[PDB]
Amino acid sequence: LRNRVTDRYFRIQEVLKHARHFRGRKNRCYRLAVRTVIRAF
Amino acid sequence: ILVCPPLRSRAYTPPEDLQSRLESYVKEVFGSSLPSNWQDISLEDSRLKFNLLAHLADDLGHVVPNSRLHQMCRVRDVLDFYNVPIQDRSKFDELSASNLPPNLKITWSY
């Protein structure tokens, strides 16, 4: 049995929804967003 | 060909003359030897137990289920079982049958 994540899109959107109002690539690139969002929180 | 009889309703209401109707049936199966304490007659004898319960199921139309057969140790136990009413209404009918306030609306989609 091979298992692959199929809902990764929703996992990323949880971060990105908090970064929409950010400036630049932080607002859409997950790897950049997450770090800024963590600092915001 | 064989035609299946229509599905029987499971609703049951104890007849008012049940105790009198049972006393007669007991006299038939067990005779008139022991009228005193007829309700205390033991049903250990399988043949006597079958005749009594079979007669009641045929007449009343309600039969002791397999789970409760061993519980019918005495005639009094048989009397208690037939004093319990059974309802065959669906849950929707049960909910609607119970008086509902004007602001509660229940719709059944099945």
Partner: protein, 93 residues
């Protein structure tokens, strides 16, 4: 990207197909059949994995022992290498 834009064809499983309907029948062949047959005899599968369980090292050793002589050259070479690899791994070398 990465997520299908349409629903996959609905899954229809026949719970009462013959295989499912008769699953488990004769699992008590011994207890109910005077122990003439053991339940493990019902097991179908590789000759070296009938009524027997083990870790990967034990399976590889068992397979080579029972059918090693019948294996294809390349398969047997891989099996020998695997056993040696697993022997070091499982013995903390």
């Amino acid at each position: 990207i990465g997520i299908r834009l349409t629903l996959p064809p609905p899954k229809v499983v026949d719970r009462w197909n013959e295989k499912r309907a008769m699953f488990g029948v004769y699992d008590n062949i011994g207890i109910l059949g005077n122990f003439e047959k053991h339940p493990k005899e019902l097991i179908r599968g590789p000759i070296w994995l009938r009524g027997w369980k083990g870790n990967e090292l034990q399976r590889c050793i068992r397979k080579r022992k029972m059918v090693g002589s019948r294996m294809f050259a390349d398969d047997l070479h891989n099996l020998n290498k695997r056993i040696r690899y697993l022997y070091k791994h499982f013995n903390r070398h």
